[PDB]
Amino acid sequence: GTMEELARRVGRAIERYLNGEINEVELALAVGHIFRDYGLEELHEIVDRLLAGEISVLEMLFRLYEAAVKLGLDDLKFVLLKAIFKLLNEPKMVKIVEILEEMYKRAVKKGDEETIKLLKEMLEVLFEIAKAIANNDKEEVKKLLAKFVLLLLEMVKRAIKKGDKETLKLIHEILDIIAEIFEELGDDELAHAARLVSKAAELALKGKKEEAEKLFEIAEEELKELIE
């Protein structure tokens, strides 16, 4: 079939594995069969390694995401990222990925193609965040999240000059989750920058978009200082 149903089938298989309905060998066999049915041999060879016991579920998910990036499958990328951030116990990152998927789905049904690139770059940043979390590199996670907040700031700046309103609400929700994550990581300046960007977005959405700009410059300057 189409690449839309492949992502749904793979997501259902991984969800069954995570909920405990099936085991590792059953998951490997089912996902390999799904990949072979759609003609994707490169993903099938990766799943063969999990079937052979060489690698684990998380490493296989990472390799599958890297291969899907090269192949250009987007819904598969979102499914794989959600599965990765569910294997590592982080509900907040899963919520961020869910909101990002909603924005991508809204963007693909219209002519907006500039936001697709932004969502791709932020997917790259989130993948790097997951890789740093897997290595327990807590210093790199903060820098990657700062880059993610800068990308969200770029998106909100682009959206304000347009008529989009639900984009502002989704970005505000994402920024609030990011600020909560920063607070739980024992940081306050980056959390303050995230909340400043969120406040600017909310002020622009409310109707007062003149006070939003000074907040935007203040927040971006602070983020650039804290990235170094």
User: Which residues lie near Zn ion (CB under 5 A)?
Assistant: 48, 188
Q: Smallest Cα–Cα separation from 132: which of 183, 85, 92?
A: 85
Q: How far is the CB of 170 from Zn ion (least distance, A)?
A: 25
Residues contacting 28, CB < 8 A, separation 6+: 47, 50, 51
Q: How far is the CB of 31 from Zn ion (least distance, A)?
A: 11
C-alpha span between 121 and 127 (Å, rounded): 10
Query: What residues have CB less than 8 Å from 1, skipping those under 6 apart?
Result: 38
Shortest Å, Cβ 143 to Zn ion: 20
Whether 179 and 194 have beta carbons less than 8 Å apart is answered as yes
Nearer to Zn ion, 30 or 170 (CB): 30
* 193's tokens: 């920058």
Which CB atom, from 106 or from 192, has the smaller least distance to Zn ion?
Answer: 192
**What is the C-alpha separation between 184 and 187, in angstroms, rounded?**
7
In the complex, least distance from residue 85 CB atom to Zn ion, rounded to whole angstroms: 27
Give the nearer residue to Zn ion in terms of CB position, either 47 or 97. Answer: 47
Establish how many alpha carbons lie within 13 A of residue 15's alpha carbon, considering only the half-sphere containing its beta carbon.
8
Minimum Å gap between C-beta 25 and Zn ion is 13
User: Of 48 and 213, which CB lies nearer to Zn ion in the complex structure?
Assistant: 48
Rounded to the nearest whole angstrom, what is the least distance from the CB of residue 29 to Zn ion in the complex? Answer: 9
DSSP category for residue 39: T
Q: Which is nearer to Zn ion, 184 or 188 (CB)?
A: 188
Q: Which residues contact 213 (CB under 8 A, 6 or more apart)?
A: 200
- Which residue number has the CB closest to Zn ion? 48
Report the Cα 9 to chain-centroid distance in Å. Answer: 20
183 or 202: whose CB is closer to Zn ion?
A: 183
